[PDB]
């Protein structure tokens, strides 16, 4: 499997004075850190969230983000006066890395404005997107004359991020590999027509996210099976609904069959 580390930031400016910035981090499907506007430190949600970092350097990292939050809102405000922009402002950042044993590690750092991409970090500098507006270029060449942030930014993606992901795969080796088995059941929901009934098959409580559910006529794979989204439970497990629109005669004697990585070879089947 793949366990990349994504760090996501949600900065929102409403008017001249009101603004909040919140963040969090993910490793695979699992969320390992939470960072709140009300808080003054990044919170760690797992006993292994610190990786193999010493306490002294986890704190200097805490310090770097602390100054980052203040300066970011200061810099973003000043851009809004400089280039004449209105104040419902929504910035999002999505950075991180992915360690590959085969020596081809990925670095990215993406910024978005009102839900549209505007610029990223590529080699040693920030670069706008083709679709971005023209004012973006005025901001981009003042950002690039901050040699320190550019130099620092380079150290986190190239250097500290791969060390972190490797530390976290060590510490959390047991929770990442865990396996929880789902349970299934059947009800009856929205009926399409008067003669057409809609049979539902719910499966709830599986940890490794990939899953496979499908209705069948015993063992003849039907195509009338249409599954929904994979929705989270508060458990850090998952839930998925599965539907099948058929008439009442073509309804006796079908099955809902589910296959998941945690059930070893056997598969839960539920008939009617």
């Amino acid at each position, epitope marked *: 499997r793949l366990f990349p580390l994504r760090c996501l930031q949600i900065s929102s400016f409403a008017n001249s004075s009101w603004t909040r910035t919140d963040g969090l981090a993910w490793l695979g499907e699992l969320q390992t850190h939470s960072w709140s506007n009300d808080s003054d430190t990044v919170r760690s949600l797992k006993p292994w969230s610190q990786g193999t970092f010493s306490d002294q*350097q986890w704190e*200097t990292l805490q310090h770097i983000f602390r100054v980052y939050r203040s300066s970011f809102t200061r810099d973003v405000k000043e851009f809004a006066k400089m280039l004449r922009l209105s104040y419902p402002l929504e910035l999002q950042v999505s950075a991180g890395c992915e360690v590959h044993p085969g020596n081809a590690s990925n670095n990215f750092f993406h910024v978005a404005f009102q839900g549209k991409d505007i610029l990223s970090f590529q080699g040693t500098s920030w670069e706008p997107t083709q679709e971005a507006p023209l004012w973006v270029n005025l901001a981009i060449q003042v950002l690039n004359q901050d040699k*320190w942030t550019r130099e620092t930014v380079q*150290w986190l993606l*190239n*250097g500290t991020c791969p*060390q972190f992901v490797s530390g976290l795969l060590e510490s959390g080796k047991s929770e990442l590999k865990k396996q929880v088995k789902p349970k299934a059941w059947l009800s009856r929901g929205p009926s399409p027509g008067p003669g057409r009934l809609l049979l539902v098959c719910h499966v709830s409580g599986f940890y490794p996210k990939p899953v496979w559910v499908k209705w069948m006529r015993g063992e003849q794979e039907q195509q009338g099976t249409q599954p929904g989204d994979i929705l989270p439970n508060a458990d850090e497990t998952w839930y998925l609904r599965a539907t099948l629109d058929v008439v009442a005669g073509e309804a006796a004697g079908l099955s809902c069959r589910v296959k998941h990585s945690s059930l070893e070879g056997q598969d839960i089947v539920l008939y009617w």
Partner: T-cell receptor
Amino acid sequence: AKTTQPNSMESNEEEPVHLPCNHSTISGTDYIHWYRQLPSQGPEYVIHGLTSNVNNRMASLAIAEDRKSSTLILHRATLRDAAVYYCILRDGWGGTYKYIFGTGTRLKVLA
Amino acid sequence: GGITQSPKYLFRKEGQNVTLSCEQNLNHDAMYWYRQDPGQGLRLIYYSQIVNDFQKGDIAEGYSVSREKKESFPLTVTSAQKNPTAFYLCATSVGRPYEQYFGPGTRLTVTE
């Protein structure tokens, strides 16, 4: 968190030179610096890198992929480039500030 | 300018000892005191991350420094040292990627 270099090295003028450095115990957050010092003066920064190869006007840095060794390349050496060359590790966190130099490689440039 | 050690040459006699300069043009928090003998590497006397703050090196024995200000870091040698005659060099550091800069250096021979 130290490095190892040859003690001596000789090279003929108007040619590129390859000066090696070893550091088997390097970490992902350590920079690599090179400094040189001429006989009666004080040293001077030459180049530095972290994870990619680096190119300047006079010299380039070449990192091995396993990061346990590297190389400082002088593109064209003249008599004036005779000096002592120091290979140094620097912690990217900036924790311990015992910034200590090793013993270096002494380059001799023949005519 | 950068760093200015002065003067180039300095002599004195044993017991008639000295304190020595190192003055800083730009603005940097950290300063270092190195020390070199003929054909030998650079050894560290004292380092200082910010004013009112020092840390001893490995040849700090028989020296003493002070940082009242960020623009000055004097070196006194009167503390009886083994070989007070050598080449003294003063350095300075910036933030990440933490590069180092040196002055022109001062040479002091003291007649034994």
